Amino acid sequence: HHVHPLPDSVPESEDLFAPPPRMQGKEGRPKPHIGPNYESYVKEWAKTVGPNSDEWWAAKARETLDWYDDFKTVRAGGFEHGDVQWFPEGTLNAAYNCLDRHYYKNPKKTAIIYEADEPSESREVSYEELMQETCRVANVLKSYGVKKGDAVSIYLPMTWQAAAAFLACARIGAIHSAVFAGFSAESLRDRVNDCECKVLITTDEGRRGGKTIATKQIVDAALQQCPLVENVLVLRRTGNKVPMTEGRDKWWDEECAKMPAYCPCERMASEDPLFILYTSKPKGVVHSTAGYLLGTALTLKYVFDAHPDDRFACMADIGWITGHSYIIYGPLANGITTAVFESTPVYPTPSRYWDFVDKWKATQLYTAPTAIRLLRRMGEDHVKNHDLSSLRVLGSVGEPINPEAWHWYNDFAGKNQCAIVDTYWMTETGSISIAPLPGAISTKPGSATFPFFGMDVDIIDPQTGQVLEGNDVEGVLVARRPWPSIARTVYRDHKRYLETYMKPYPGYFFFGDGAARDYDGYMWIKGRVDDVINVSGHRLSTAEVESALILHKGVAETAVVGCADDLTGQAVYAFVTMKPEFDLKATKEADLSKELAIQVRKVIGPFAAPKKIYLVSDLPKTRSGKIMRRVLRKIVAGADPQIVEEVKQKVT
Numbered sequence: 173h174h175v176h177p178l179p180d181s182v183p184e185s186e187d188l189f190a191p192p193p194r195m196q197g198k199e200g201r202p203k204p205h206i207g208p209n210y211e212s213y214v215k216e217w218a219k220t221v222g223p224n225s226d227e228w229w230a231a232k233a234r235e236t237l238d239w240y241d242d243f244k245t246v247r248a249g250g251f252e253h254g255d256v257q258w259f260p261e262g263t264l265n266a267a268y269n270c271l272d273r274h275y276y277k278n279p280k281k282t283a284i285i286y287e288a289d290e291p292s293e294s295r296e297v298s299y300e301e302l303m304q305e306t307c308r309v310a311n312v313l314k315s316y317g318v319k320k321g322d323a324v325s326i327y328l329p330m331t332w333q334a335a336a337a338f339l340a341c342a343r344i345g346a347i348h349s350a351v352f353a354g355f356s357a358e359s360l361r362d363r364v365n366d367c368e369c370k371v372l373i374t375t376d377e378g379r380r381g382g383k384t385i386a387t388k389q390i391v392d393a394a395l396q397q398c399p400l401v402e403n404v405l406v407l408r409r410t411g412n413k414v415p416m417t418e419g420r421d422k423w424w425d426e427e428c429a430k431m432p433a434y435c436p437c438e439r440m441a442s443e444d445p446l447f448i449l450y451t452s453k454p455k456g457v458v459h460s461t462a463g464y465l466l467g468t469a470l471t472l473k474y475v476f477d478a479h480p481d482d483r484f485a486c487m488a489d490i491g492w493i494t495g496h497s498y499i500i501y502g503p504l505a506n507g508i509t510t511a512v513f514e515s516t517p518v519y520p521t522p523s524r525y526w527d528f529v530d531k532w533k534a535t536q537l538y539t540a541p542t543a544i545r546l547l548r549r550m551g552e553d554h555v556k557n558h559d560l561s562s563l564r565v566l567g568s569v570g571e572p573i574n575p576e577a578w579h580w581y582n583d584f585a586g587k588n589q590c591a592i593v594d595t596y597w598m599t600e601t602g603s604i605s606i607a608p609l610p611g612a613i614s615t616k617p618g619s620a621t622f623p624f625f626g627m628d629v630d631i632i633d634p635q636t637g638q639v640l641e642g643n644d645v646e647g648v649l650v651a652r653r654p655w656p657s658i659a660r661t662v663y664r665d666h667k668r669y670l671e672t673y674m675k676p677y678p679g680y681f682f683f684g685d686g687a688a689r690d691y692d693g694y695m696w697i698k699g700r701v702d703d704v705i706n707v708s709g710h711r712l713s714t715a716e717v718e719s720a721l722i723l724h725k726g727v728a729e730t731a732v733v734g735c736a737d738d739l740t741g742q743a744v745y746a747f748v749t750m751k752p753e754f755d756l757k758a759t760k761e762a763d764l765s766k767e768l769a770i771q772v773r774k775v776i777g778p779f780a781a782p783k784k785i786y787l788v789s790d791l792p793k794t795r796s797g798k799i800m801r802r803v804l805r806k807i808v809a810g811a812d813p814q815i816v817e818e819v820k821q822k823v824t
């Protein structure tokens with residue numbers, strides 16, 4: 173075979189995992205929406221793509237969402253000029269479909285499981301309580317003069333009220349622009365200025381992993397260079413003394429106390445912007461209302477086989493698109509219970525995730541590979557002794573998942589009884605693009621499998637632009653047609669939007685990842701095209717090599733980048749993080765990096781061997797969990813910021 177799976181210790185003949193009994197409607201579990209085999213997936217998938225899919229999408233749009241005014245046209249526009257349209261004549265409100273209509277049905281039903289940084293301070297937040305706090309904040313925003321189309325910045329930590337902040341902006345037609353609680357004043361500054369918002373929401377302080385976040389302090393430093401900001405709503409999260417600017421800053425609780433607990437919904441056009449999300453100049457991705465909301469609802473319902481009574485647990489942060497889509501809009505659109513996790517995976521201990529699952533009986537869990545590798549690094553005592561039988565599905569998101577981690581996830585977290593869904597997508601896709609449907613697809617470690625409804629992808633040659641037709645091919649991934657949840661522009665920078673995604677390969681959407689469709693049709697996302705290494709003509713993906721390195725005993729996490737090599741063009745350079753146990757004194761470093769080079773030669777090839785390996789305590793990662801390989805590539809070429817100092821030193 174030309175295309176090989178990500179290196180794994182299990183033989184390929186014993187590495188295919190059919191949907192287990194919890195996803196077969198047995199043991200009293202819900203029957204999956206799509207099942208039981210790959211055929212049942214294509215039968216429905218094929219309805220959602222091609223020129224004959226309008227009828228299907230028109231129905232799902234009316235099945236999934238409540239509409240103030242119905243739509244006439246289903247889709248229009250294209251990539252060329254960035255004029256994507258979906259249900260343009262229709263109107264709705266995001267807050268209504270995430271709150272009101274569910275409050276009217278079961279008001280005492282839990283909407284949010286607020287898992288506070290301290291486990292004892294956790295509680296349930298019903299829809300009634302959530303809708304009421306949302307309407308109060310909306311009325312506060314309206315009292316500040318916020319109008320439909322105005323941008324509002326949200327600098328909130330993972331407290332449950334962040335959902336109220338989001339939905340309050342969408343209730344009145346404003347455009348919220350959420351920023352990671354923890355970002356520096358300079359990063360916050362640039363994002364508050366680009367969106368030109370006049371209102372800012374934040375807390376006095378944040379709490380994560382037992383460490384405080386001086387949100388109001390960082391905000392004060394930022395707003396010194398944000399002239400437009402006139403009003404700041406400050407939430408009392410810790411109650412510790414923080415500076416408050418007279419006139420500009422008002423307390424959340426005191427402002428909401430003056431307002432009613434209901435607020436009418438603004439009638440939004442399908443294509444009115446819902447939010448701006450800036451990606452780490454700053455790129456403010458913009459999403460519309462109807463299309464983004466429909467994509468998050470359908471993906472959640474089908475990719476996680478969500479049912480009315482489930483308790484979905486996405487452990488991401490709302491500063492990330494993963495939180496936007498699968499903490500707030502997605503789950504609450506479907507009217508179920510969702511989790512707001514304020515802590516880390518290892519506070520107070522590396523058992524927190526599992527203490528959480530058994531406490532609330534999470535029916536699905538959804539986190540990043542960087543966290544799965546973290547818990548793997550901490551031993552199996554923290555997880556082995558839990559029940560966790562309430563789970564049915566386990567999700568990975570943010571990067572390629574090494575089969576080694578995929579197995580640990582499958583073994584201990586799911587006790588080999590849960591489906592593993594490797595969900596591939598981007599901030600610019602709005603919702604999950606390629607992922608296995610858990611009740612129908614048999615999984616391969618590290619493979620996203622097949623594309624989701626509305627997504628028709630192709631493998632194109634990166635230079636010629638020709639479609640590699642069929643199986644056992646590899647290249648760069650691209651989409652053939654728009655999908656409902658696709659981003660519509662970059663805020664006040666539609667040229668960057670077209671030049672980044674639409675002009676590289678005229679006719680398609682350009683994700684920026686390498687991909688391979690193996691002999692069975694499974695898709696394999698190998699990493700960022702920018703991270704590809706060209707060793708004497710061979711194109712090495714970062715997932716291939718990293719997955720191989722983590723196959724050696726004691727390896728915790730790895731990151732490989734490229735650098736100029738006179739003989740080979742580029743050479744591979746590896747940054748390796750070893751587990752706590754591994755005694756770096758007893759074992760010669762030279763002998764270790766030599767065993768690793770061999771490990772790569774044996775499974776990949778004699779060209780993928782690193783020309784140099786660096787041992788480091790950690791890796792440069794973003795808040796979401798992405799490994800910042802561009803940094804490592806820049807260094808070799810000459811979150812926790814203190815990790816860059818160790819790299820510049822260990823490399824030099």
Ligand SMILES: C=CCOP(=O)(O)OC[C@H]1O[C@@H](n2cnc3c(N)ncnc32)[C@H](O)[C@@H]1O
Pocket residue numbers: 493494568569570571572573594595596597598599600620683684685697698699700796
């Ligand atoms: C997850 C959504 C939000 O991610 P965002 O911050 O927009 O970054 C998107 C990128 O994450 C990678 N990526 C994400 N999921 C996967 C995945 N499942 N496998 C491999 N790479 C992945 C892949 O490079 C993609 O372009």
